[PDB]
Amino acid sequence: YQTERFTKFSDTLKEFKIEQDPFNIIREFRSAAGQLALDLANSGDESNVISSKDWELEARFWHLVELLLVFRNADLDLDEMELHPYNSRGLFEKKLMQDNKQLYQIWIVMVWLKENTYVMERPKNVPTSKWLNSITSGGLKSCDLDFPLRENTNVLDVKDKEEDHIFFKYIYELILAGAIDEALEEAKLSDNISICMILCGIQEYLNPVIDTQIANEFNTQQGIKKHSLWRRTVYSLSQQAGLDPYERAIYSYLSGAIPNQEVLQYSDWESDLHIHLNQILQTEIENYLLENNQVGTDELILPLPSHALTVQEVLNRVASRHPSESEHPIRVLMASVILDSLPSVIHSSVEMLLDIIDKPYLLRIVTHLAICLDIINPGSVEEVDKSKLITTYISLLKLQGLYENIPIYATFLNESDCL
Amino acid sequence: KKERHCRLTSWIVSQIGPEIEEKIRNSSNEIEQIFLYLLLNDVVRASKLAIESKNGHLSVLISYLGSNDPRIRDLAELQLQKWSTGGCSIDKNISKIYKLLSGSPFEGLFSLK
C-alpha cells in the first residue's frame, strides 16, 4: 500500500482549506512523515532502511519548522522585565532569554537537537555501591572521587574503572539528550552522590523572595550564587586527565566547552552542532552577566573564551567537519530554516529545475513547505516559485496516477484554470 | 537578614583570620588546608587548591558551600552514613568537608564537635 504517502500530505491540506492554526498543517506533516518512517523501518528490504531514515529526517525537519515558525510568527509581544542590581543572576539570565530573540532561537534549536538524540538503554547489573572492588581489595585510604587523583590512578581496580566508564558514558548520553532529571536520578541511585551534586551546579541562583517576578515558579531559593566560579571549577576539572573521557566530556559540556577528542570524534552533525550552540549560548550568557556587573571579580579564576560564534559560522564549521551529512538535502533545509534563509533556498531548488529530480522526497517537501509558508506568511514565497513547484509536483501526481487529489493543490493560482 | 548575616560572617572571619592562617602555615597535608580555607569562609581558594592538588571532584562539591541546597545536604549526609557503616577508610579531612556540606557539622553523626 505504502505508495499512499502523497494522500496523507494531500489529506492534511484538504482538512485545512475546508474548516474555513495553519501550524497544524506542518504538525501533521511531521506526524505523517513519522508514521511513514515507522512503516519502511519495521519489516523491510534493506533498501528500505535508507528511505526510512530519509523519512525520520523528513519528520525532524517538519518539527524544527514548527518550533521555529511558531516562535517567530506567533510572536505577539509581551511585557518587558525590569530588573534591579540587587536581583539574582537567575533573573538576568531569564531577562536575556526574553529580550534577545536571536539567542532564544538558539535555545529552541538546541531543544530540538536534544529531542532527537539517541540514548543507550539503562545499564543493567549495576553494582550495589561505588568503587566496591577497590574497597574490597583494600587500598582506598579515602573513599572520595578525588583520592586516585591525589595520587596515582593505580589505586583504582580495573573493574571499577570499567564501571565508572559505563556510568559516565550513560550520564553523558543522557545530558546530551536533555535528560537532566534522569541523570540526577541515575547519579543518586547508582551511589554517585558527588557527581549528582556536580550536576546540581547547573542552575543559576534565584530567590523567590528577592526575585519577586518568579515567586510563582519557586517557593524556595535555589541554584548556586558563585556560578562563574562553579563554571571555572568544572572546566578545570574537565581538563584534568586521569579522569574517564566521558566524565571529562560531561564537565566540558557543563562549562560551555568542547569535549575532548576521544569523545568528540564520535559525534555527528547533530551532536557536534549541538555542542557548539551550547558553547555560543554559555558564552553569550556569561557576557550578558559581565555587561551588567552581576559577576564578581574573585570568581574569574581562569580564562574561558569570551567571543561567541554566530550561528552562521558554527553551521559553516560543523558543515566542513561533516561534509557528507551536511550536504544531505533535507539537512540543508534544516540549516536553511535555522538561518531563516528559507524562501532563499526554495527559489534556489526551484532553479535546480531549469540532481533534485533524482531524490523523491525533495520535490514534494519543498512544495508542501512553500504552501505552508505562504499560508502562514502570505507573500513568503514568490508567486512564480509556487507556480513552478506545484506544476512539477502535480505532473508527478499524474505519473503516479493520483489525479483524484489534484484540485486541492490547484487552490493557489488562477493558473489552475489550465487544468 | 542576608545583609546582616553577611556582615556578621565577614566579621567573624576578620577575627579568626590569623588563627587559621597560622594553622595553614603549619599543615603538611593539602586536603586539611582545603578544609582550613573553608574555615575562613573562602570557598573559592578551597576550590582552587582542590583543583591544584588534583582533588577535582571535591573542588566541584566545595562550590556548593553557602548555597543551602537541601538536596546536596541530604546527599552529603547519606554519603557519610554509608561510609560510617563499613566504609573501610575515608580520609580524615574529606569527611570533615562532607560534614560541612551536610549542613549540621556538630549536630551530627560524624561530628566536628
Residues of B in contact with A229 (CB under 8 A): 43-44, 47, 63
**Nearest 10 degrees: Cα torsion A193, A196, A198, A203:** -140
Q: Closest Cα partner for B91 from B60, B65, B52, B57?
A: B57
β-sheet bridge partners, residue A204: A224
Vertex A356: Cα angle to A351 and A362 (nearest 5): 105
Contact A150 B54 (CB under 8 A): yes
A 364-403 residues inside an 8 A Cβ radius of B: none
Asked if A132 has any chain B CB less than 8 Å from its own CB, the reply is no
Distance from CA of A330 to the nearest CA of B (A): 42
Asked whether the CA dihedral A212, A218, A224, A227 is positive or negative, the reply is negative
Structural method: cryo-EM
For residue A205, the 8-state DSSP code is P
Burial A126-135 (b: 16+ CB within 10 A, else e): eeeebbbbbb
Contact B67 A225 (CB under 8 A): yes
Cβ-based contacts under 8 A for chains A and B: 123
Asked if A197 has any chain B CB less than 8 Å from its own CB, the reply is yes
Interface test with A, best of B10, B13, B49, B67 (most A CBs within 10 A): B67
CB-CB contact of B67 with A223 (8 Å): yes
User: What does the alpha-carbon distance between residue B34 and residue B43 come to, in Å, rounded to a whole number?
Assistant: 9
Q: Closest Cα partner for B112 from B85, B87, B80?
A: B80
Contact B69 A141 (CB under 8 A): no
Contact A197 B76 (CB under 8 A): yes
Number of helical H runs and strand E runs in chain B: 6, 0
Contact B64 A138 (CB under 8 A): no
Give the nearest chain A residue to B56 (CA atoms).
A237
Q: How far lies A149's CA from each of A155, A240, B56, B57, B75, in Å?
A: 9, 9, 8, 9, 22
Q: Taking each helix axis from N to C terminus, what angle separates A329-338 and A360-376, rounded to the nearest 10 degrees?
A: 20
Residues of B in contact with A205 (CB under 8 A): 67
Residue with cell 572521587: A145
Cβ neighbours, 10 Å, residue A371: 26
| Displacement of CA A279 from its chain's centroid (Å) | 13
Which residues touch A324 (CB under 8 Å, ≥6 apart)? Answer: none
- Nine-digit cell at A122? 539503562
Q: How far lies A392's CA from each of A5, A328, A355, A367, A397, in Å?
A: 17, 22, 15, 9, 9
Q: Closest Cα partner for A167 from A125, A199, A202, A123?
A: A123
CB-CB contact of A289 with A338 (8 Å): no
User: What does the alpha-carbon distance between residue A133 and residue A123 come to, in Å, rounded to a whole number?
Assistant: 18
Nearest-by-Cβ selection for B91 from A142, A226, A240? A142
Interface test with A, best of B29, B41, B61, B101 (most A CBs within 10 A): B61
- Resolution attained, angstroms: 23.0
Contact B89 A143 (CB under 8 A): yes
Contact B75 A193 (CB under 8 A): yes
Q: Closest Cα partner for A213 from A98, A103, A101, A293?
A: A98
Distance from CA of B6 to the nearest CA of A (A): 14
Helix, strand, coil shares of chain A, percent, nearest 5, are: 65, 0, 35
Interface test with A, best of B60, B62, B72, B98 (most A CBs within 10 A): B60
- Nine-digit cell at A379? 507573500
Contact B67 A145 (CB under 8 A): no
